Assembly symmetry: D2
Homo-oligomer: 212 residues x 4
């Protein structure tokens, strides 16, 4: 009868704010996490608020298209930032090349880590506008696929399971790199928590085929 939608919370950074120095600044982490990521969480919740109010009869009409777009963009922002932080680890700890199933999967689907790294780097550097590059697991095939995302919710589609994501909205790098997205993406390699990615990939491998 009465709808109470579960709202979104800003997850804590998985490390302290200078953990990614000198590749990503504490300052970038503060803006990026506590302001931009927070904004997407809040934007997602604000859609949910409109929906709820409509469904519980406090709002008479709702612009379902606008609320959908709002929800989806901001939820995309939330989930992708959440992934993004998880995918990184202190400059010491993360980085280097993946081992385990993920490393093997990358070799299988891109030939080598270096060929993957190159194509993935280029996918990130060549997001037109702002967005993301994502290494995803395709449940249909079991193949890894590189995706781009523009904004948080254009170009990307469903069912693909993102394992690793790099944000190339300018705010991810502008404080530290200004316009030099390329030099950001290049260095971001050294922050990758490949265990995190591995663990996600293991989970992905064991998700039931939902559609096909």
């Amino acid at each position: 009868s009465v709808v109470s939608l579960k709202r979104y919370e800003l997850p804590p950074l998985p490390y302290n704010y200078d953990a990614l120095e000198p590749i990503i600044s504490a300052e970038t982490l503060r803006y990026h996490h506590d302001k931009h990521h927070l904004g997407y969480v809040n934007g997602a919740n604000a859609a949910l608020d409109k929906l709820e109010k409509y469904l519980n009869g406090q709002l008479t009409d709702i612009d379902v298209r606008a609320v959908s777009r709002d929800f989806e963009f901001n939820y995309g922002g939330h989930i992708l930032h959440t992934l993004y932080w998880l995918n990184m680890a202190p400059k010491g700890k993360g980085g280097g090349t993946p081992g385990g199933a993920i490393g093997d999967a990358i070799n299988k689907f891109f030939g080598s880590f270096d060929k993957f790294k190159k194509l993935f780097g280029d996918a990130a550097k060549n997001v037109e506008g702002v967005g993301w590059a994502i290494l995803a697991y395709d449940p249909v095939t079991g193949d890894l696929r590189i995706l781009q995302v523009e904004k948080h919710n254009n170009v990307v589609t469903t069912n693909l399971i993102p394992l690793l994501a790099v944000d190339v909205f300018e705010h991810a790098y502008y404080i530290d790199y200004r316009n030099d997205r390329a030099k950001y993406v290049d260095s971001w390699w050294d922050l990758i928590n490949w265990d995190d990615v591995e663990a996600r990939y293991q989970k992905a491998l064991n998700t039931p085929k939902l559609i096909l």
Copy 2:
């Protein structure tokens, strides 16, 4: 070393081609499934072909943005059509209102089946341009969420698990309804295989939280 990407296949319709009459014509099913859906499968595979050729060194350069966009749009087309067919059942068998966990989940998150039906119908009817309305499971919250999708890969974002989808590209209805998307979406309710949706929702409920 040598990449061999797993290509996509056009799944068989889950019923004969006049199974959805008089709501959706055999003719629509023939065009929609065997031509449009096929085209997305083929378009997805053609991206994979470019990627492979690039990665195995037959193509020197690849436009990673273009191949990404191509892959994602067409894969979206494939997966969403695949869902779409599965979500329907002969005019006899499917339709009516959901029971089981899904029916309860709809009541919980939209108040009633009728409030959901109204909002979902409006989400479909008010896709701007062409796209989809999707009833999805949000693994983060356990909430159902209504999404829109424009094309197969705009507005939508990742992580959300689509349970039920209605295509509102014009080709889904134009043969049978011409411009009257609304009358199509209204009738499409009578084709819903709610067991299919239930089964997907059960699977969704038991997918490990991938991100958050």
Copy 3:
């Protein structure tokens, strides 16, 4: 003080409804012009209504993003359909290859009419999803440019002056060609009112450089 925004009208078809047979059906013209084009006009006006009501204080708040998107999509729909109809002429009268400044301009910028026709046809056939191909005049350079448009208001940008446009939303062709957009675009060549295009191009040539 009191805002009264000028609303949009559906312009009359520039020929009777069977004027484009057998390439485009009267039936297609009826749906396409009197329903789809009308819908964009109405959608554009409905945005204007929200804006006005907001600005004159009848609506307290407005979702400026949503109204902007609404206005722009539908205005795009209106203006592009308006162009589209004007660009065609009875199967007898229109068609063939352009002479005058436009024909020369096409030769200059694409090498030959056949090279232009091929690339323009391919641009139309390869709109991903629905949209338009447009032959535009670039005031900055004086060059013709081929554009795509997705929906009526994605991919395209401002300042470019559209001269000739072909709609490849499915509704432009589905009644007559079903999924065979290609065969539609191929035949649409025979409807082009090249004088209309010429006249527009003359006007374009004599528009003051607005920006650059």
Copy 4:
């Protein structure tokens, strides 16, 4: 016979690089103009290069969709930045409220400068992702319309004549305002060269109705 497409040039800033201090930094102007704007010019030209090479037979096949998208995004970037710079004037000289036909037009279509300023500010602040807010002249009606643009070439459509544009890609403000787009847009008001806008609006008023 042989196509030689006219490429794009980066126009000079219409003032020295610290002319907009303290609202927009010299540093922002250097990155924004000499790197980001330059990048769009170059990206536009690189599309033109592919087109030319294809048309003159040096490239066998072209991905017309990809080149179209590339051209349109970057040309949008070029033309909109070009407008953006022109629309600003040293903190001394520009700013305040418009007089002349433009000031009257704003009063006519938004009620008052303050109502316009509020709605326009909100349109800029509420671009989802990155893009632009634009005050445009609608040749069809003679009405001013506020547009949003996402990236340089989404949401916007043709025929509308942009008079005034504010960039809300993060790079327009991030150096000076970090995430505080709102405080940027608010201050940007003080840089508006309203004479520039007036002059453009005069030109717009005297452009022949191209379509309708």
